[PDB]
Structure formats: structure tokens, C-alpha cells
Ligand binder design. Structure first.
Ligand SMILES: Cc1c(Nc2c(F)ccc(NS(=O)(=O)CCCF)c2Cl)ccc2ncn(C)c(=O)c12
Length: 272
């Protein structure tokens, strides 16, 4: 495979963080890059990993984090562009950046634009959340962390337990239960997007009044817990508040898909 970066070319730099799936470093390879290093594979796992890289190779869009190559030594790794800036999670919940409503709407629009692109390519993200949406140069949304779905979800020792803890807030009721036919769908991505909209339009994570992540898992999975939409800022447009409730519908068939979502956001942006 021609997308393997030969060993010895990448220089690792700053450790950005160690998540439930891999550690990300800033790096140098023809300039700044990000390097996500996975676990410390059999021939079958190497072939499966290359198959997953095939999915990443399908994505070429300015709202999608740019895949640049992969490595197998010292460990399996994914190399992408380096985003100059912070994630949406960092802005909203850590440093509490005060975006104007017009810019919050634009961030929502750009996120929907990337999701629409993925879905058009038959890619279900499965892991959308504000800490893998990066605000590049404070201007351009880049969505990442949709790669290696089979590696993340199916391989032994991929820290699935930790992944659950880190993703529960964005996870649709049917993804929690995994009982319905095809629990991961375009519609479950829409629900996660609905939670990102909640974060943008309230400045808060959902369920901040519920201390217990187990109660959240059980309650959302039972269809008995939804974000408190009364916390949306006073200047959030009513059409945007309605859209957010549509994306968050507990019954997945009631959720709009991203062509409709994009048209709604674009209409209200161009209505100001
Ligand atoms: C955390 C992070 C990443 N993470 C990251 C990565 F390193 C490698 C792959 C994926 N995702 S992927 O699905 O495997 C590929 C998707 C495209 F194909 C992601 Cl999300 C990337 C760039 C970053 N730039 C700036 N900053 C501040 C960051 O924190 C940052």
C-alpha cells in the first residue's frame, strides 16, 4: 500500500493527549502533522487495518480532517494534518470561548457540511463529538475520529470500556442498547450532531445536572432522558432550537438527515 509512510520520515513532537483510543502527538512530516499512535498486529489485523485506511482514503473535503498517511512501525498509526487551534470541546467547555451566535451557527453549518459529505460517501461516522471537531485557524471546522471503526469496536483490547465512558453523552438511545436492527446509522450520527448543537447553543454539556454516568447510560437507553432545551441562549434562533429537537428525537426514524439539516441551517443563516 502506497499510503504507508516509510519508517524514519516522521519526527514525533508534543503529546496532545492520550484518549480511550490512541495517543495523539504533534509531528513533523513535510511540515506539521498530527500522529495518532495506536496499541503497542497479526497479518490478518494488518490487512484489516489497511482495509480501514481504504475508508479514510475516500475522504477529501475541507470539513473533514485530512488523512495524510499511516505507519506500521513502531506501532500502527494514522497521520493527518495538524489543525491550528483547539477542538470545539476545548473552546466551549474548557476555556469557555464566547462565540457570537452568527459564528456558532456557522460552526454548526460547517459540521453539517462535513457530515453530509461522509454520508454521501456511505461513511457512518459512529463517534461524532465535540472533542473530535477541530476549529482550524479559528475558522474552518475539521471533523475527525471516524476512522478504524472495526479496529475501535471489534478488536480485543481496543479499550471499548473506556470508549463508552468517553462517548456516552453523544450516543443515541439505540446505539446505547445495540438491540435494534443496524444500531449505527445515518440517524445515529444525526443524534450525535444534535448533541453538538446543544453544546454550541447552550455552552454546556448535556445532563450536567446528572452526576452519575450510569444513570445517564440507563436513562437515555430507556428513552427516558433528553437534553434540557431550556438552557439554549436567548439569542439562539427558534428555527435552530426546533432543528436541534428534531435531531435529538428518541425515535430514530423521526430524525432528519443531513441534506435536510444543511438546508435548514443554510436557510436560517441566509435569513439573517
Ligand atoms: C486530536 C487531534 C487529531 N486527532 C486525530 C489524529 F491525530 C489522527 C486521526 C484522527 N482521526 S481518524 O478518523 O483516524 C482520521 C480522520 C481523517 F482521515 C484524529 Cl481525530 C488530529 C489533528 C489535531 N490537530 C490539532 N489538535 C489541537 C488536535 O488536538 C488534533
Amino acid at each position: 500500500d502506497d499510503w504507508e509512510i516509510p519508517d524514519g520520515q516522521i519526527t514525533v513532537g508534543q503529546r496532545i493527549g492520550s484518549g480511550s483510543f490512541g495517543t495523539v502527538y504533534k509531528g513533523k512530516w513535510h511540515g506539521d502533522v498530527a500522529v495518532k499512535m495506536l496499541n503497542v498486529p497479526t497479518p490478518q489485523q494488518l490487512q484489516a487495518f489497511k482495509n480501514e485506511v481504504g475508508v479514510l482514503r475516500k475522504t477529501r473535503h475541507v470539513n473533514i480532517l485530512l488523512f495524510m498517511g499511516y505507519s506500521t512501525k513502531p506501532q500502527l498509526a494514522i497521520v493527518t494534518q495538524w489543525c491550528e487551534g483547539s477542538s470545539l470541546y476545548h473552546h466551549l467547555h474548557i476555556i469557555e470561548t464566547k462565540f457570537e451566535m452568527i459564528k456558532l451557527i456557522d460552526i454548526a453549518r460547517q459540521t453539517a457540511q462535513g457530515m453530509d459529505y461522509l454520508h454521501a460517501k456511505s461513511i457512518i461516522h459512529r463517534d461524532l463529538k465535540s472533542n473530535n471537531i477541530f476549529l482550524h485557524e479559528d475558522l474552518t471546522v475539521k471533523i475527525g475520529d471516524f476512522g478504524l471503526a472495526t479496529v475501535k469496536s471489534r478488536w480485543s483490547g481496543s479499550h471499548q470500556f473506556e470508549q463508552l465512558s468517553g462517548s456516552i453523552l453523544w450516543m443515541a438511545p439505540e446505539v446505547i442498547r445495540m438491540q435494534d436492527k443496524n444500531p449505527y446509522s445515518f440517524q445515529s450520527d444525526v443524534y450525535a450532531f444534535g448533541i453538538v448543537l446543544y453544546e454550541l447553543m447552550t455552552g454546556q454539556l448535556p445532563y450536567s445536572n446528572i452526576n452519575n454516568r450510569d444513570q445517564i447510560i440507563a436513562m437515555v437507553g430507556a428513552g427516558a432522558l433528553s437534553p434540557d432545551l431550556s438552557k439554549v441562549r436567548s439569542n439562539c434562533p427558534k428555527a435552530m432550537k426546533r432543528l436541534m429537537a428534531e435531531c435529538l428525537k428518541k425515535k430514530r426514524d423521526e430524525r432528519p438527515l443531513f441534506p435536510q439539516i444543511l438546508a435548514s441551517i443554510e436557510l436560517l443563516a441566509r435569513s439573517l
